Design a binder for this molecule. Structure first.
Ligand SMILES: [Zn+2]
Lengths: 276, 76, 94
DNA sequence: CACACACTCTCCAATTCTCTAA
DNA sequence: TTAGAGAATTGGAGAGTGTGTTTTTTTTTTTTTTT
């Protein structure tokens, strides 16, 4: 069985605070991140660089008026992968409508949206369907904390100190760290699939499959409600037109000759850059 | 050999009829289409051959099913 | 314990919404007829309606199997004959 | 090691069949 | 001969026994014949 443990993080309160930050932050146009999301909706930008200096300033500002925060900067430097999903979910909730005449000549994703919505609606009245990542047209990143020069950086802010490949111990796994070193071998760009868009020969229903495993198994089984109730046992066909791809590059960072202790050999660390 | 020539003509004719369904290009060309059938259905059937005629698309719809019935059957 | 049984042509399924009322409504406004055109095109257009009705009513079985099963049911099950007699009586009034 | 494949072991309800039905 | 009550059989999903991987010949020495 799986035991249970008690951890004082409270992801729900953190998500509420995250939504408040994305709505009620204005750097010294409206809110900065709402303006950024407006630019994203206009398809003029696809990179949400969530700065950590801004989150620190937001926490400091609300510290004087209620301390309505749980040290988010210290809560995502400890586990950043989950908070990428949290930020993406908060952005999808507060995504403004476009305020520009964007050409929709290539709207395959929008076409699938409306087509599947109409097919579902013609039977919903009886006269989530889409994976969250499929609809997203933006990549979310984190900008690490800058220099603090204050008591806040009391050995904290591990993303502020540029480490070396040797100092990346095993207990840093999952944290948001920064390394300093010389790139040695960057690979070519390859399209890494995030969600496949299988289409069935009959039953008309297309089923998506999110994948982050470096290797997956195709479904090839029309488990849709109509196909199962009719027992047609249809097979699935991939549709790269309706699939979602993200550019993937696999760099490799070494360490400078000044960071290597005497008598040792420089180490290396694989880097997976993807998105923009 | 006269009957040989006639049989070659007949088999050439049937082979010509056979190639009327095959695509001008390779199988992996990926010809995908949706038939706007009654009830605004968006059923997806593959094949660039179906893009030529709607009857070919309907036949590809018919033979896509893998289920078949039982046909009964029977010198000293 | 037991697999889900395969759906068969039940009597209730024969009277689906996309069934007898649909074909009776669209018979006079779906298929066009012209003797000038080749007979193969007319025959294919005629069979198109029944094929689509069968598929959107029963996508599991194929064409020939569906028609054979329907013919056997009509020859065996008398409820279909009773319904046909009722519609014939209704049409006789005109 | 274990997840996926190929396949022997095994099993009830829909499909066929012929005695008694109308 | 017809619409309908009885026997009789066997295919399609699933319990299960045993599989099959990952898995590698670079770079570095040492020899040997020609050069
Ligand atoms: Zn299917």
């Amino acid at each position: 069985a799986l035991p249970s443990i008690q951890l004082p993080v409270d992801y729900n309160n953190l998500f509420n605070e995250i939504t408040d930050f994305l709505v009620t932050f204005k750097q010294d146009k409206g809110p900065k991140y709402m303006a950024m999301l407006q630019k994203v909706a206009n398809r003029e930008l696809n990179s949400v660089i969530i700065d950590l200096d801004d989150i620190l300033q937001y926490q400091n500002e609300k510290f004087l008026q209620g301390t309505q925060a749980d040290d988010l900067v210290s809560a995502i430097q400890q586990n950043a992968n989950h908070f990428t999903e949290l930020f993406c979910r908060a952005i999808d909730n507060n995504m403004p409508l476009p305020t520009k005449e964007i050409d929709y000549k290539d709207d395959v994703l929008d076409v699938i949206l409306n087509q599947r919505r109409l097919r579902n609606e013609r039977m919903l009245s009886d006269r989530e369907l889409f994976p969250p990542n499929l609809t997203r047209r933006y990549f979310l990143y984190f900008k690490p904390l800058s220099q603090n020069c204050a008591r806040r950086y009391r050995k904290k802010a591990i993303s502020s100190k540029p480490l070396s490949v040797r100092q990346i111990k095993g207990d840093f796994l999952g944290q948001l760290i920064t390394v300093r070193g010389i790139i040695t071998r960057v690979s070519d760009v390859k399209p890494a699939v995030e969600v496949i868009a299988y289409t069935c020969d009959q039953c008309g229903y297309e089923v998506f499959q999110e994948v982050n495993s470096r290797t997956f198994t195709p479904l090839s089984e029309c488990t849709s409600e109509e196909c199962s109730q009719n027992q047609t046992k249809g097979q699935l066909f991939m549709s790269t037109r309706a699939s979602k791809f993200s550019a993937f590059q696999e760099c490799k960072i070494q360490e400078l000759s000044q960071q290597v202790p005497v008598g040792h050999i420089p180490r290396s660390l694989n880097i997976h850059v993807n998105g923009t | 050999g006269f009957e040989l020539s006639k049989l070659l003509q007949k088999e050439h004719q049937m082979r010509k009829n056979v190639i009327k369904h095959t695509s001008a290009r390779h199988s992996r060309f990926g010809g995908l289409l949706s038939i706007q059938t009654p009830d605004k259905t968006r059923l997806t059937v593959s094949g660039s051959q179906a893009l030529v005629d709607e009857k070919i698309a309907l036949q590809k719809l018919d033979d896509s099913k893998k289920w078949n019935k039982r046909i009964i059957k029977k010198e000293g | 314990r037991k697999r889900r049984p395969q759906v068969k042509l039940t009597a209730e399924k024969l009277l689906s919404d996309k069934g007898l009322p649909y074909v009776l409504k669209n018979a006079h406004k779906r298929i066009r007829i012209s003797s000038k055109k080749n007979s193969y095109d007319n025959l294919s257009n005629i069979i198109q309606f029944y094929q689509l009705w069968a598929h959107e009513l029963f996508p599991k079985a194929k064409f020939k199997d569906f028609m054979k099963i329907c013919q056997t049911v009509g020859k065996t099950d008398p409820v279909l004959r009773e319904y046909r007699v009722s519609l014939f009586r209704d049409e006789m009034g005109m």
